[PDB]
Design a binder for this molecule. Structure first.
Ligand SMILES: Cc1ncc(COP(=O)(O)O)c(CNC[C@H]2O[C@H](O[C@H]3[C@H](O)[C@@H](O)[C@H](N)C[C@@H]3N)[C@H](N)[C@@H](O)[C@@H]2O)c1O
Ligand SMILES: Cc1ncc(COP(=O)(O)O)c(CNC[C@H]2O[C@H](O[C@H]3[C@H](O)[C@@H](O)[C@H](N)C[C@@H]3N)[C@H](N)[C@@H](O)[C@@H]2O)c1O
Lengths: 408, 408
């Protein structure tokens, strides 16, 4: 009753937030003492594991004033800014406390520098009202055009490039591939329109760098993979497009525990070693789960890879039964969205999660053996996770029909 | 050269950031080993003291997952929301990572609830471009009218009340008195326009509550005094005006170290004891300093009280000389803005600081003896610290003239 906001979090079947009282590594403990395996991981921001020792020791020293104070520039900030630039590229870098803040600030800065009114957008960019819209493919009141990753619509808007300030996309790699990114970049280069790569979720997710070399971003944003859940986002890119960032300052800019979490996490993420380990362990869990369901005739497949994957169910009913069965075994999934294991998802935890998937499979057998994975199932589950249209061959009339089905 | 932003921080006379390696209580240590007394305190967000051990212990435990994880609701959140509603009041509460984000979210929500386009504003509300304006007393492109705490301009805009969604003010108590607040509240009650009290700086600063009972805010925001520098801001007030906050969610919402810092700090700030101790200690420093300058012919006075005060210098040459002399003695002032001691500013620190101020006064004696504080000195100093016009008697044409001198 007290809380005016509606934060995204795991919720039970009746909509009330699931309470977890402690966590460590890959395991969460609920009030009754039951241990769950976390695949949500603070919506993908805990990439090293809950309570990671090295980060925790750095945070504790920073809370005791040993590595700088919030009053002033600290010795470690230069190394943070320098490594961000080495890993992600760009002329200049900037820092924020949320992805929402970073996305609003850089989009306004790029719009100002370009002196053009229209921004074309696909993917989620945060909660700020500037992104709200009543319908896709047309400007909202802030000049933003949602194009749902549809390149026919994008091509049309870019055929009048004079008025387009920038294209901002949150890249997805479960449902968009080489073909889509090659044509996206071809179109934007032809229009000479700068691209803002919103890599809040996928920046540093797959390797020590941005998510695909097929994109050529003028500006990038990363956050979830940067600080093991502490509130830090970073931006970088072309100096003239980010000129307006000179007016950005906020009180907690130099707060030392966030600085400790970001520097300690980035030094490790910049080696690529956590992403490689997560990839191997997650790949094993995916392969085990895919074969389990296929052998038991459960109509649920997987998209993505070990770093970032999602469940594709034939229908809503299937997804509901899956989610109840998963919860009963102590698997904590981000329901209808993407699963992002952390480095704490070791070989032993994989074994444990596979045993829990074995029991979910056994609890779903013979209930939905008839149902097929239709094109409708693939678009609906992709729409939940990457917030637009999957790259699957389709007619223009089919685009309209999908959007009519799925738009909120 | 890497940073695209210009964060507010102590800088030397050439504009380069002063670097500090470590801090404990009221003392900072610089790279050369010199100890400085901090009056800036992360722009007033460190109210207990750098490295406060009780907060550090709670942060360290939270960093190890001992009371919750960023994935999910936990009991620490229930207690925090309850503590906020108990100290500040209101129907509902919400949380943010910065004062800037909180102010933008509540202002948009209130404007949408009121279905009116004009917001009247005084004081600083954060870095977001929605507050940028070319001229005072006229609506910017977002419908916001800056009125610089001038109640004659406010009365003019409230004489046409039907299009005024809200009045948002950052209360000042160094240069605005009881008479200002009683007339402000009378005018806004008469127009039936809700008041948003931006108490990011002054909320809990002076007592265990908001800054003055002479305001009747429909919505309040606090931050600086909440978490000893960790990135937490809170809002609350009338449920119907904050209904759009149901759309607010962000990835780090459940981040446990920030919640640990806030619950621990707020528990101490809710007793009123830290603010009483700071008031007493800061008052002793102010009295000593005012007399040191006065008895040496140095044209520098002080405004405010022990919780929050500022220097008022005859002119900018005096202020520049004062700031250079202060840094030479290891006093770390928020230059040209307000000083906010922490609870680590104990009597032993007061005595040290008074000796340093004696040396500052000695360094300035004889340089500026023939200069005096004018009304222009008071308006210029107030403008830098509270971002509007001091409450001194003046006509409407004198207001225009002062603003023409000070508007940047
Ligand atoms: C790509 C991207 N850009 C910006 C942000 C905003 O960052 P902050 O949260 O730090 O401000 C994010 C945030 N990612 C959160 C999830 O967004 C989508 O899912 C839904 C959210 O769960 C919900 O809270 C929103 N109201 C709607 C949104 N569609 C993604 N499906 C999910 O994968 C993300 O974890 C970015 O991801
Ligand atoms: C009252 C108030 N509301 C909102 C904010 C924004 O909070 P966040 O910083 O967490 O986003 C603040 C912040 N206060 C910081 C200082 O602001 C003013 O000082 C100047 C700033 O330092 C500078 O960055 C700005 N460009 C201009 C601004 N005038 C206050 N004078 C200073 O006293 C504050 O400490 C609020 O204070």
């Amino acid at each position: 009753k007290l809380l005016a906001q509606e934060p995204t979090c795991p919720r039970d079947a009746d909509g009330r937030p699931r309470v977890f009282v402690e966590g460590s590594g890959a395991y969460l403990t609920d009030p009754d003492g039951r241990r769950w395996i976390d695949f949500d991981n603070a919506r993908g921001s805990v990439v090293l594991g809950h309570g990671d020792e090295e980060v925790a020791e750095a945070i504790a020293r920073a809370a005791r004033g040993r590595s700088g104070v919030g009053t002033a520039w600290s010795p470690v900030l230069d190394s943070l800014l320098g490594q961000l630039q080495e890993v992600c590229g760009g002329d200049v870098v900037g820092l924020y406390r949320t992805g929402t803040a970073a996305l609003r600030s850089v989009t306004c800065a790029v719009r100002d520098a370009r002196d053009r009114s229209i921004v074309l957008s696909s993917g989620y960019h945060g909660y700020d009202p500037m992104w709200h819209c009543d319908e896709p493919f047309t400007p909202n009141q802030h000049g933003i055009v949602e194009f749902l990753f549809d390149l026919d619509v994008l091509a049309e808007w870019l055929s009048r490039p004079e008025q387009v300030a920038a294209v901002v996309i949150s890249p997805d790699h479960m449902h968009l591939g080489e073909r889509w990114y090659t044509e996206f970049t071809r179109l934007t280069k032809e229009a000479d329109v700068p691209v803002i790569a919103d890599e809040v979720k996928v920046g540093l997710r797959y390797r020590a760098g941005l998510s695909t070399p097929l994109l050529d971003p003028a500006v990038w944003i990363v956050a979830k993979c940067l600080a093991n859940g502490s509130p830090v986002a970073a931006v970088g890119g072309d100096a003239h497009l980010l000129a307006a960032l000179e007016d950005v300052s906020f009180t907690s800019y130099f707060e030392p525990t966030a600085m400790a979490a970001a520097t300690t996490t980035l030094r490790r993420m910049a080696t690529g070693e956590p992403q490689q380990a997560i990839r191997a362990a997650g790949d094993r869990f995916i392969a085990h789960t895919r074969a389990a369901f296929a052998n038991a005739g459960v109509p649920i497949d997987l998209a993505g890879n070990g770093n970032l994957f999602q469940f594709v169910c034939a229908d809503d009913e299937v997804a509901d039964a899956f989610h109840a069965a998963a919860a009963a075994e102590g698997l904590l999934f981000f329901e209808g969205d993407n699963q992002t294991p952390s480095a704490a998802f070791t070989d032993e935890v994989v074994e444990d999660a596979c045993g829990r998937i074995d029991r979910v499979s056994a609890a779903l057998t013979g209930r939905f053996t008839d149902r097929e994975l239709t094109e409708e199932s693939w678009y609906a589950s992709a729409w939940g996770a990457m917030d637009g249209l999957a790259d699957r061959p389709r007619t223009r009339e089919e685009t309209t029909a999908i959007v009519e089905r799925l738009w909120e």
